[PDB]
Amino acid sequence: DATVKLGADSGALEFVPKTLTIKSGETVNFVNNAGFPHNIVFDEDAIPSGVNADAISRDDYLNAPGETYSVKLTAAGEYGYYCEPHQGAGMVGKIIVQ
Ligand SMILES: [Ca+2]
Ligand SMILES: [Cu+2]
């Protein structure tokens, strides 16, 4: 399993790390950190074949420090995702599943 912080400790509107590599079957824990609210929306155009973007996204906002969203990914490939309220500020990331 791995952790991605939503917002840097400094307040920067970024996923930390921006590009994460995990093995198939690991759970990714998105932890609310700074600059919230944030959400985690996977991009339909940038996920492996057969994966449902809606099913793995967290649309509803994370509002409190430490609030966590966990999701297990199994299909190998790349998964592009973003935070809706901060997509314009460049809050986008990627998960590479091996
Ligand atoms: Ca980084
Ligand atoms: Cu955000």
XYZ file of C-alpha atoms and ligand atoms in Angstrom:
100
model
C 0.000 0.000 0.000
C 1.035 3.623 -0.519
C 0.061 7.100 0.522
C -0.625 10.165 -1.586
C -1.033 13.466 0.240
C -3.738 15.844 -1.079
C -1.958 19.176 -0.926
C 1.713 19.663 0.088
C 2.488 20.623 3.707
C 3.380 24.091 2.390
C -0.172 24.555 1.032
C 0.740 23.863 -2.594
C -2.190 22.406 -4.582
C -0.595 19.185 -5.631
C -0.772 15.456 -5.090
C 2.362 14.274 -3.253
C 3.897 12.359 -4.939
C 2.593 13.500 -8.321
C 3.476 10.164 -9.999
C 3.199 7.077 -7.867
C 4.231 3.544 -8.835
C 2.600 0.547 -7.145
C 2.228 -3.161 -7.741
C -1.120 -4.595 -8.858
C -3.357 -5.185 -5.806
C -1.883 -2.495 -3.580
C -4.224 -0.052 -1.898
C -3.545 3.669 -2.388
C -4.487 5.867 0.555
C -5.266 9.457 -0.399
C -4.824 11.538 2.742
C -6.268 15.028 3.070
C -3.347 17.344 3.944
C -3.643 21.017 2.967
C -5.637 23.330 0.747
C -8.833 21.204 0.999
C -11.485 20.542 -0.027
C -10.156 18.131 -2.597
C -11.597 15.091 -4.367
C -10.102 12.280 -6.473
C -11.515 11.845 -9.920
C -9.965 9.374 -12.343
C -9.826 10.361 -15.936
C -11.864 8.016 -18.237
C -9.474 8.822 -21.053
C -6.429 7.777 -19.047
C -7.142 4.491 -17.300
C -6.573 0.853 -18.323
C -9.108 -1.051 -20.506
C -11.941 -2.513 -18.497
C -11.591 -0.185 -15.509
C -14.585 1.991 -14.579
C -13.504 5.558 -13.713
C -16.667 6.306 -11.669
C -16.371 3.191 -9.602
C -12.865 4.101 -8.349
C -13.298 7.871 -8.030
C -14.160 9.766 -4.856
C -16.431 12.552 -6.086
C -17.557 13.792 -2.791
C -15.104 16.293 -1.208
C -12.640 15.492 1.605
C -12.956 18.372 4.047
C -10.888 17.670 7.111
C -7.105 17.178 7.717
C -6.366 13.449 7.840
C -9.621 12.475 6.113
C -8.705 9.439 3.899
C -9.999 7.763 0.740
C -8.597 4.309 -0.009
C -8.822 2.412 -3.254
C -7.292 -0.883 -4.405
C -6.099 -1.019 -8.010
C -5.451 -4.251 -9.801
C -5.359 -3.740 -13.569
C -1.832 -2.965 -14.851
C -1.272 0.338 -16.669
C -1.459 4.052 -15.980
C -4.215 5.898 -14.172
C -4.514 9.612 -14.653
C -6.547 11.496 -12.045
C -7.260 15.014 -10.815
C -8.887 17.074 -8.137
C -11.935 18.850 -9.554
C -11.823 22.056 -7.540
C -8.038 22.478 -8.325
C -7.670 20.987 -11.813
C -7.063 24.529 -13.140
C -4.302 25.085 -10.591
C -2.634 21.929 -11.945
C -3.652 19.484 -9.205
C -3.356 16.322 -11.352
C -1.509 13.080 -10.793
C -0.807 9.606 -12.098
C -0.565 6.146 -10.711
C 1.401 3.502 -12.513
C 0.275 -0.033 -11.597
C 2.845 -2.764 -12.314
Ca 6.518 14.531 -6.562
Cu -7.818 19.846 -4.654
